[PDB]
Amino acid sequence: LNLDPVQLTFYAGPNGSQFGFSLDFHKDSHGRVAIVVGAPRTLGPSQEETGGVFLCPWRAEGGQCPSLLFDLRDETRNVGSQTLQTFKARQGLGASVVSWSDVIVACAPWQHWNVLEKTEEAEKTPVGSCFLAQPESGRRAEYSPCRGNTLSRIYVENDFSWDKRYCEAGFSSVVTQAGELVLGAPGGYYFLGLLAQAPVADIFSSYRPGILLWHVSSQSLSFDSSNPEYFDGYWGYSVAVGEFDGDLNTTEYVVGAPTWSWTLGAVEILDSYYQRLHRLRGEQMASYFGHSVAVTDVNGDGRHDLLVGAPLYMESRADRKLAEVGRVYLFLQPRGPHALGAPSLLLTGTQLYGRFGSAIAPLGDLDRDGYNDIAVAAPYGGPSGRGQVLVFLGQSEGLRSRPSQVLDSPFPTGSAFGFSLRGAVDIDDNGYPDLIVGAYGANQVAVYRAQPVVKAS
Amino acid sequence: GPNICTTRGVSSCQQCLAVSPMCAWCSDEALPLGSPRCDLKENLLKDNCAPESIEFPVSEARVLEDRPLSDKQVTQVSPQRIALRLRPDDSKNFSIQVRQVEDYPVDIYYLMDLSYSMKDDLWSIQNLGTKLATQMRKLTSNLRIGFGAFVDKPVSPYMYISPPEALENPCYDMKTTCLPMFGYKHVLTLTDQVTRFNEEVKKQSVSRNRDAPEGGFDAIMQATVCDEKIGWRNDASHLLVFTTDAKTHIALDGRLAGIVQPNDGQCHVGSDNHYSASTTMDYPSLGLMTEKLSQKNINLIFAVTENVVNLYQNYSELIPGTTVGVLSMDSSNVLQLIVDAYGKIRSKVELEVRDLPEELSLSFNATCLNNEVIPGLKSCMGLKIGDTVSFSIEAKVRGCPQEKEKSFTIKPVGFKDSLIVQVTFDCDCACQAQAEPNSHRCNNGNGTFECGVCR
Ligand SMILES: *[C@@H]1O[C@H](CO)[C@@H](O[C@@H]2O[C@H](CO)[C@@H](O[C@@H]3O[C@H](CO[C@H]4O[C@H](CO)[C@@H](O)[C@H](O)[C@@H]4O)[C@@H](O)[C@H](O[C@H]4O[C@H](CO)[C@@H](O)[C@H](O)[C@@H]4O)[C@@H]3O)[C@H](O)[C@H]2NC(C)=O)[C@H](O)[C@H]1NC(C)=O
Ligand SMILES: *[C@@H]1O[C@H](CO)[C@@H](O)[C@H](O)[C@H]1NC(C)=O
Ligand SMILES: *[C@@H]1O[C@H](CO)[C@@H](O)[C@H](O)[C@H]1NC(C)=O
Ligand SMILES: *[C@@H]1O[C@H](CO)[C@@H](O)[C@H](O)[C@H]1NC(C)=O
Ligand SMILES: C[As](C)(=O)[O-]
Numbered sequence: 001l002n003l004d005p006v007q008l009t010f011y012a013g014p015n016g017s018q019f020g021f022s023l024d025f026h027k028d029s030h031g032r033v034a035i036v037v038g039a040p041r042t043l044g045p046s047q048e049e050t051g052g053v054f055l056c057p058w059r060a061e062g063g064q065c066p067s068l069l070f071d072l073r074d075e076t077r078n079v080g081s082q083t084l085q086t087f088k089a090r091q092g093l094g095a096s097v098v099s100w101s102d103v104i105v106a107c108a109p110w111q112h113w114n115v116l117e118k119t120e121e122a123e124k125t126p127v128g129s130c131f132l133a134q135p136e137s138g139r140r141a142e143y144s145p146c147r148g149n150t151l152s153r154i155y156v157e158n159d160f161s162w163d164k165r166y167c168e169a170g171f172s173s174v175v176t177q178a179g180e181l182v183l184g185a186p187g188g189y190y191f192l193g194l195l196a197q198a199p200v201a202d203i204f205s206s207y208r209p210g211i212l213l214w215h216v217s218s219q220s221l222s223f224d225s226s227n228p229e230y231f232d233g234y235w236g237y238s239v240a241v242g243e244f245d246g247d248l249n250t251t252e253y254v255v256g257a258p259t260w261s262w263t264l265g266a267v268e269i270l271d272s273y274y275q276r277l278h279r280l281r282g283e284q285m286a287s288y289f290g291h292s293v294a295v296t297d298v299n300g301d302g303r304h305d306l307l308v309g310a311p312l313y314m315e316s317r318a319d320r321k322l323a324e325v326g327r328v329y330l331f332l333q334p335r336g337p338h339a340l341g342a343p344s345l346l347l348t349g350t351q352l353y354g355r356f357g358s359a360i361a362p363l364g365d366l367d368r369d370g371y372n373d374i375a376v377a378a379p380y381g382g383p384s385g386r387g388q389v390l391v392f393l394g395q396s397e398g399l400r401s402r403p404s405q406v407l408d409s410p411f412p413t414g415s416a417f418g419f420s421l422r423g424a425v426d427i428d429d430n431g432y433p434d435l436i437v438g439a440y441g442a443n444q445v446a447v448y449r450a451q452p453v454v455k456a457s
Numbered sequence: 458g459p460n461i462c463t464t465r466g467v468s469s470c471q472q473c474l475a476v477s478p479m480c481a482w483c484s485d486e487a488l489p490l491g492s493p494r495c496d497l498k499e500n501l502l503k504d505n506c507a508p509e510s511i512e513f514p515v516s517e518a519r520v521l522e523d524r525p526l527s528d529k530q531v532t533q534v535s536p537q538r539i540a541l542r543l544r545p546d547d548s549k550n551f552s553i554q555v556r557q558v559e560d561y562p563v564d565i566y567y568l569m570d571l572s573y574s575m576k577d578d579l580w581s582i583q584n585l586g587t588k589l590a591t592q593m594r595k596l597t598s599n600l601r602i603g604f605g606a607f608v609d610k611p612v613s614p615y616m617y618i619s620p621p622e623a624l625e626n627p628c629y630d631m632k633t634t635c636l637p638m639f640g641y642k643h644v645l646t647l648t649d650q651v652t653r654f655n656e657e658v659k660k661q662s663v664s665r666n667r668d669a670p671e672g673g674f675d676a677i678m679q680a681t682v683c684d685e686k687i688g689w690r691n692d693a694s695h696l697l698v699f700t701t702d703a704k705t706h707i708a709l710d711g712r713l714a715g716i717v718q719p720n721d722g723q724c725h726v727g728s729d730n731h732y733s734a735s736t737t738m739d740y741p742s743l744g745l746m747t748e749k750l751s752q753k754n755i756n757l758i759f760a761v762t763e764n765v766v767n768l769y770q771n772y773s774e775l776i777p778g779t780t781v782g783v784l785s786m787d788s789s790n791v792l793q794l795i796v797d798a799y800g801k802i803r804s805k806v807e808l809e810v811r812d813l814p815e816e817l818s819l820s821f822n823a824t825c826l827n828n829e830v831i832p833g834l835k836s837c838m839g840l841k842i843g844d845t846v847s848f849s850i851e852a853k854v855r856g857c858p859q860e861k862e863k864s865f866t867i868k869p870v871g872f873k874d875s876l877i878v879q880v881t882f883d884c885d886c887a888c889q890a891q892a893e894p895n896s897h898r899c900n901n902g903n904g905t906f907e908c909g910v911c912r
């Protein structure tokens with residue numbers, strides 16, 4: 001119980017804003033720590049849901065936070081014979097947030113977009129968008145790699161090839177250590193899913209206020225497929241990064257496609273040019289294998305290991321009866337150029353409809369025993385069904401089969417305690433990594449501090 | 458020699474019968490003074506009591522109405538009426554047979570995928586609809602059928618939201634016309650009016666949405682949990698037949714529409730016959746569907762086209778009790794699943810007593826399909842159509858009620874037939890009719906004379 005469950009800090013956002021739907025740690029420039037929090041149904045001055053982002057500084061007491069201002073008005077712009085339009089109603093700004101260096105990236109997956117030319121159009125569709133902010137300088141930029149100006153008719157004659165109109169870019173997001181932003185777009189290419197990547201430096205430098213449609217020169221998008229296995233696979237529902245080919249110069253991507261091959265689900269590991277290295281198939285259909293993906297070295301051998309979440313996995317029980325509890329899979333990375341194999345360990349939920357594996361967070365080395373640890377969210381788990389987060393400690397063999405600590409939700413029913421999870425950062429500067437937990441249903445975020453031993457309370 | 462009949466020292470024939478069922482009385486005037494009048498029948502005959510003068514009532518159960526059980530008015534219980542003659546503290550036993558001759562009540566609700574991909578399939582599902590009515594009608598006369606339609610969650614990016622004409626006509630940009638998009642729509646409540654069901658099904662036409670996977674699992678959930686709307690009957694056997702030509706949306710897909718609230722498993726249809734939570738609540742998970750299908754005792758049948766038959770067979774394994782058929786122009790395959798389903802329907806013969814007197818008390822010996830007599834049980838289980846079970850009932854009375862003429866009922870649950878039992882209490886003697894009051898033979902006309910005794 002070395003994560004103090006009594007001395008909790010609570011931050012809160014507006015009612016109905018889904019404050020805590022996403023979150024991340026932010027180190028300004030570059031010492032003090034703050035929490036960026038997404039609230040994707042925050043109202044704008046107009047009383048329509050545009051979403052918002054909050055930047056909470058560290059305070060033991062917690063409370064309300066300042067809003068990170070973004071452009072919330074719709075844009076209309078005529079270029080040549082075309083009219084380009086953005087629609088921010090219900091766009092879900094703060095559906096995903098991620099901090100890198102002195103920059104915060106916040107995305108609106110359901111921002112709509114349209115282009116008009118004479119009597120024709122591209123169709124009004126959710127291409128999505130991400131907003132980048134440099135909070136100290138006040139600088140702003142945008143990145144919306146799925147916006148196009150091809151008219152409806154052309155896609156019909158193409159049989160809908162290279163159709164990025166429903167991307168929902170920024171559904172998921174991650175930044176590499178080098179500063180490459182990687183966006184998941186599950187609706188890409190007519191719901192196959194795609195990834196879009198660009199250097200944060202180049203997004204800022206190539207952005208021009210009032211353009212709406214532009215090409216970031218160093219950007220890189222994944223590919224369309226005619227392979228039925230990928231159809232409606234939601235490739236990019238979740239995303240992560242790591243080292244998986246033993247070459248520290250290159251960086252690999254981990255992508256979740258939780259409805260791949262007729263809802264079997266799959267996680268793929270690719271290089272930065274989207275050429276796939278390994279594929280992990282789902283165990284059971286409709287389990288949403290790949291809903292979440294985490295990367296960390298849990299067994300201390302210096303090689304990143306893979307954690308995949310299957311929240312809707314149904315477990316076998318007496319009298320041939322299945323029970324939806326959720327499951328998490330651990331894949332240890334072997335030495336040499338060898339590929340990953342079968343799961344080294346299967347962690348399974350206990351509570352019915354609990355959705356164990358819905359979120360997976362690296363905690364770093366929580367008890368400083370030389371092995372990194374993880375936290376797994378069961379947003380509707382625990383005896384009451386109010387939510388639960390389980391801490392699993394790492395070891396030489398992989399991870400422990402049973403949790404060292406179980407954090408029960410302090411919020412009422414429907415809070416979604418655990419839906420978002422982040423750790424591996426020392427927030428109060430006591431030398432020990434802490435954990436933050438979102439409860440978007442209650443519009444709150446809980447901060448759990450690590451105590452300076454393997455303590456209890 | 459001596460017994461409870463003689464030791465009581467009874468004054469009258471009536472009191473003699475009240476002592477015990479085994480006692481008899483001797484009215485014969487030629488019987489000497491020393492001999493006892495109230496005794497066993499053997500001992501009375503042994504003391505030269507005339508057979509004519511012996512008063513010894515016997516309990517009996519005469520069948521009044523004994524029509525035989527029906528084959529293939531309807532007789533499921535036999536006998537139907539019985540007259541019970543009981544004397545003080547006695548108990549006569551009788552028999553009753555039950556047979557499930559009548560057809561089982563069956564409810565079929567039909568879910569029609571009416572998205573644009575079903576355009577070329579529309580005839581098939583309309584044919585299948587009316588052929589369901591026919592197939593089930595010839596299996597059981599007690600049928601009630603209904604239907605509803607689904608497409609998908611009417612929200613971007615499933616729904617075309619431009620231009621403004623596309624909301625009222627999704628097929629606008631194809632220069633044709635289809636209906637506006639809807640999640641799930643309940644068209645016709647479960648009803649016996651089959652000819653109306655056939656008319657309505659043939660009127661249906663397709664709508665259009667964007668993505669191949671559809672929202673049929675919303676429809677299955679609502680068709681399961683909206684009892685009063687759909688109109689399932691408590692006693693009936695419930696079949697839910699589901700048609701589609703495409704893959705399906707499952708829980709957690711809804712996040713592409715901004716929907717994150719888990720499916721609460723409750724009914725949200727109501728007044729306008731539309732699933733009102735379609736745009737605000739996520740698709741249901743396989744487990745939640747299973748819970749509710751089991752809870753509401755509904756059998757799900759997948760009637761899907763051949764291109765997704767393996768997909769739904771696979772889902773069928775994750776939802777036990779579910780069967781899958783191939784939807785096409787030929788309706789043989791899916792109708793067999795309806796025949797199979799009926800052939801699994803089992804019923805129970807559970808006896809219940811009504812209007813039983815306070816003084817009467819019953820006990821039952823049951824003989825079910827295994828033909829073994831189990832005492833103290835009044836219910837058999839696992840009956841098919843035509844199967845017969847048997848019960849042995851014993852009616853015991855406590856003393857002698859002065860109400861005399863009563864009657865009670867023994868009725869199986871769910872059956873309309875019943876055994877009526879008329880009860881009579883014979884507490885008097887034959888010589889009590891010929892009573893001469895104020896007779897000068899007994900104390901100067903102060904005492905009555907009956908059965909060879911003064912009062
Ligand atoms: C509904 O559910 C069924 C049952 O799960 C699915 O059918 C299975 O599909 C999988 C995936 O295609 C099959 O697995 C593949 O089998 C191929 C052939 O295997 C033959 O030999 C084995 C002997 O071990 C027999 O058991 C089997 O019956 C076959 O005769 C292999 O070529 C495949 O290997 C390749 O891919 C795998 C990754 O999956 C790699 O690991 C290998 O290196 C290799 O590249 C693979 O093993 C499985 O056989 C099917 N089982 C059955 C019973 O049919 C349906 O696909 C599914 N359908 C839908 C729509 O949901
Ligand atoms: C949030 O809004 C809802 C409206 O559905 C309201 O009923 C509730 O009281 C509000 N919550 C709080 C904490 O005020
Ligand atoms: C009642 O049970 C007895 C068992 O001794 C049996 O002999 C008799 O036939 C039964 N009565 C009737 C009316 O069938
Ligand atoms: C039921 O069976 C028991 C045990 O054989 C027997 O004592 C009793 O008389 C039977 N009752 C009837 C009504 O047949
Ligand atoms: C997904 As459709 C072509 O049946 O509306």
Ligand SMILES: [Ca+2]
Pocket residue numbers: 243244245246247248249250251252
């Ligand atoms: Ca590498």
Ligand SMILES: [Ca+2]
Pocket residue numbers: 296297298299300301302303304305332333
């Ligand atoms: Ca490792």
Ligand SMILES: [Ca+2]
Pocket residue numbers: 364365366367368369370371372373393394
């Ligand atoms: Ca550790």
Ligand SMILES: [Ca+2]
Pocket residue numbers: 425426427428429430431432433434449450
């Ligand atoms: Ca700390």
Ligand SMILES: [Ca+2]
Pocket residue numbers: 574575576577578702
């Ligand atoms: Ca079709």
Ligand SMILES: [Ca+2]
Pocket residue numbers: 608609615666667668669670671672
């Ligand atoms: Ca659809």
Ligand SMILES: [Mg+2]
Pocket residue numbers: 024025099100
């Ligand atoms: Mg970070």
Ligand SMILES: [Mg+2]
Pocket residue numbers: 572573574575669671703
């Ligand atoms: Mg369709």
